[PDB]
Design a protein around this nucleic acid. Structure first.
Lengths: 154, 50, 83, 53, 124, 84, 53, 55
RNA sequence: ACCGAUAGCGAACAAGUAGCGUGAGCGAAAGUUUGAAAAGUACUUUGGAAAGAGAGUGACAUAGAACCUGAAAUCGUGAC
RNA sequence: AACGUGUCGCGAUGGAUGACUUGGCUUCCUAUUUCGUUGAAGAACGCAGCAAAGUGCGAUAAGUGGUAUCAAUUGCAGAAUCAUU
């Protein structure tokens, strides 16, 4: 798995990857994204913060009918959700990386996330009975996450 | 129903023994293309019927 | 209804299994393995279903013995053992 | 004796053309190979016998 | 003059189909130059026990004795050449005859006998 | 998997095989003494095609008639040769 | 002799939202209804079958 | 279709019993003939051999 | 002087199987590690667990059992 | 800020691709022509150290026997077993 982007300095950055996660992918994109996604500084603090003292997680891509929330203020926008499922994941993810920051020796007191790359992984199938006997797929979109963390300094 | 002839008795028996994981020890050998216990019967899917 | 309830009514078991060929089509009451046509002392096939014919045509089994005939014939019957 | 024969034949000619021969022998690339044409080669000079002995 | 193959598909097929008995036949060795020179055989079919040298492959030039002859995979395990398994366990490699050459043979009656025919077919 | 038992049973095959072999042939012998019948049951008397079991026995087939026979005597045809 | 050509397949006709061809007869197969006989079908005839003379 | 002035409306193979995806049937090619030739020949010669004293 | 895994037999495959249909019958899908081999990733270490990160292997793992290649559609990313 | 747009590198995604190809598929030959109520074919169910399948086999059940040959077989078993009978 040649995952992601060419990532610098063998000295101080750290790589993990996990596959096919079980949250709806697009959704998860917006989950991931707040950490990564953007634009630097906003992404970095918030992960340290939702994930170390907050709830609503921003969304700004997917459409539908999609609820409105004041929490979207967090964004200056109108979508974010609070979808539990994902969240859990996110926490894990950091964490191995962090234990790897022991082994790399990096300062876990302030590591920074750069370049997460979150990808659609191959989808789950199953079936439903409709009137007159018609059947549709009711399918599923899991996740690919691969993560890097930076923390050089002055 | 309640009762169900010896022949009938045979058909399940023969099948059951097949309805479980292929003998693993076999699997291990040299050149074992061996996907899985293909033909395994099941019941909440696959009534044997009749 | 028309169907599905009446799909409730399919407790026919209609045709059952057979002796000679097995499967099914065994009419109980007028007794026939459609297939082997057991009862009857010969067996059935028709043209049209040629594929079926192939499906039944010998070898498909095991010609258990007959197989061996080819060896044996070819082994031309010099008989007995060498000793 | 093959050698005897050939040698003169070489001397008298057979070297280049002959050497194209045997040596321009390649496995037939492409599928004819896989319809059993495995190798190919060119052709080189002709002796005609009245009959061979 | 019969001017072709000797058709590969069939042939190619046949090889894969080699029985036990047959494997043994097919597998013959170059005989040691010396050994060749000795009994005056061309090449000779294997069996356990005996001694060989690695010619080519990536691992050109390795040498050793026959432990084991695994015909299905067409292998010789030769003694004291091995690979290590991660664990720390040596696991012997295996091998094909024509890139090895037999240095030394085990000779019983049967051996002697076979040898005789062979040696003959070269030598006599 | 004190695996050795298979062989032992296979040994059983061997006595058993033999045994019938003997008996069977025992039997065969004591059947004869007449050119035919009951010497020796069919199962002592070895199947050999429907046709092969059928067939014209050679006597009756080669043992044709006087008319021919005389004739045969009269018109043999072995070798001649011609050219000149 | 009759390569390809082999299901008891029939053309389904018109009104069925679809090109009007032969289709496989049978269910479950998940060949179920798949286009039949000819040329254009999977494993089928080809156009112009391959003639003896 | 092309313009060529040629020899009117013909060509024949696209007629009866030329077994199609149907089946039929009345078949009798001569391609056997090499083989056949040989069959005549090989036999013939081989026959001779057997008969042999005979004119 | 055939086809090349949607081809080619139905069927390269435990296929006329599986499957399907009351039954008659209908009757599929389904290919390849290794310049050489499992040498099939010990070990560390985090990780409930998967797993991860290391490591470790091996030319090559953009070769880690989805094994040749790896096309296009579609998408994240980078980068703009 | 947004969405799009774009590039490209790279990554995913997919299973293309080529290359292979015991597969198909055709032609042509030999034959000491070809079943079975003497119980065939086909059917059934059975049988392995550990076997599901396949495959083999038929309670003499993954077989015996003869004969031929002449040390393997290996997933793990097993056996010192080669002057060997």
């Amino acid at each position: 798995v040649h995952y992601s982007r060419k990532p610098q300095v063998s000295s101080k950055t750290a790589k993990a990857k996990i596959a096919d996660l079980r949250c709806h992918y697009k959704n998860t994109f917006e989950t991931a994204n707040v950490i990564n996604g953007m634009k630097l500084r906003k992404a970095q603090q918030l992960y340290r913060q939702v994930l170390a003292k907050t709830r609503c997680i921003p969304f700004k891509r997917y459409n539908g009918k999609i609820g409105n929330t004041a929490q979207a203020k967090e964004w200056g926008q109108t979508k974010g959700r609070w979808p539990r499922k994902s969240v859990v994941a996110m926490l894990s993810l950091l964490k191995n990386a962090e234990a790897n920051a022991i082994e790399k020796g990096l300062d876990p007191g302030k590591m920074v996330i750069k370049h997460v790359q979150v990808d659609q992984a191959p989808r789950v199938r199953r079936r439903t009975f409709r009137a007159h006997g018609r059947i549709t797929p009711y399918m599923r979109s899991p996740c690919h996450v691969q993560l890097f963390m930076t923390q050089p300094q002055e | 129903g309640r009762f169900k002839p010896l022949a009938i008795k045979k058909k399940y028996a023969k099948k059951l023994k097949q309805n479980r994981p292929v003998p693993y020890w076999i699997r291990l050998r040299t050149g074992n293309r061996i996907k899985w216990n293909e033909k395994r019967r099941h019941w909440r899917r696959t009534k044997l019927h009749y | 209804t028309k169907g599905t309830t009446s799909m409730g009514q399919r407790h026919g078991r209609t045709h059952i299994l057979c002796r000679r060929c097995g499967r099914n089509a065994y009419h109980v009451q007028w007794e026939r393995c459609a297939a082997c046509a057991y009862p009857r002392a010969q067996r059935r096939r028709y043209n049209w279903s040629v594929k079926a014919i192939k499906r039944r045509r010998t070898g498909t089994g095991r010609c258990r013995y007959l197989k061996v005939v080819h060896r044996r014939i070819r082994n031309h019957f010099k008989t007995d053992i060498k000793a | 004796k093959t050698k005897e024969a050939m040698t003169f034949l070489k001397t008298v000619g057979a070297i280049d053309d002959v050497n194209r021969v045997n040596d321009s022998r390649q496995i037939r690339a492409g599928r004819g190979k896989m319809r059993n044409r495995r190798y190919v080669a060119r052709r080189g000079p002709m002796l005609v016998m009245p009959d061979n002995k | 003059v019969g001017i072709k193959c000797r058709n590969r598909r069939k042939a190619r097929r046949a090889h894969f189909q080699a029985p036990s008995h047959v494997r043994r036949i097919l597998m013959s060795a170059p005989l040691s130059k010396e050994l060749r020179a000795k009994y005056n055989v061309r090449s000779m079919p294997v069996r356990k026990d005996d001694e060989v040298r690695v010619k080519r492959g990536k691992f050109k030039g390795r040498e050793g004795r026959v432990t084991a002859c695994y015909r299905l995979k067409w292998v010789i395990h030769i003694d004291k050449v091995s690979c290590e398994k991660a664990n720390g366990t040596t696991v012997p490699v295996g091998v094909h005859t024509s890139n090895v050459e037999i240095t030394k043979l085990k000779l019983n009656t049967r051996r002697k006998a076979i040898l005789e025919r062979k040696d003959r077919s070269t030598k006599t | 998997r004190l695996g050795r038992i298979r062989t032992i049973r296979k040994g059983i095959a061997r006595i058993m095989t033999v045994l019938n072999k003997n008996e069977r042939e025992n039997l065969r012998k004591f059947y004869s003494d007449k050119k035919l019948r009951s010497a020796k049951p069919k199962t002592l008397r070895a199947k050999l095609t429907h046709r092969r079991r059928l067939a014209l026995k050679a006597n009756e087939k080669n043992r044709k008639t006087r008319r021919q026979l005389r004739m045969a005597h009269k018109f043999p045809r072995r070798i001649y040769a011609v050219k000149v | 002799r009759l390569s390809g050509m082999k299901h008891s397949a029939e053309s389904w006709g018109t009104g069925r939202a679809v090109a009007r061809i032969p289709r496989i007869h049978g269910g479950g197969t998940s060949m179920s209804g798949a286009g039949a006989f000819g040329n254009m079908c999977r494993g089928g005839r080809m156009f112009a079958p391959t003639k003896i003379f | 279709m092309p313009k060529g002035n040629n020899a009117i409306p013909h060509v024949h193979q696209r007629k009866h019993w030329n077994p199609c995806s149907s089946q039929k049937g009345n078949v009798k090619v001569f391609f056997n003939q090499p083989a056949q030739k040989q069959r005549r020949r090989r036999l013939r010669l081989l026959k001779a051999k057997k008969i042999f004293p005979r004119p």
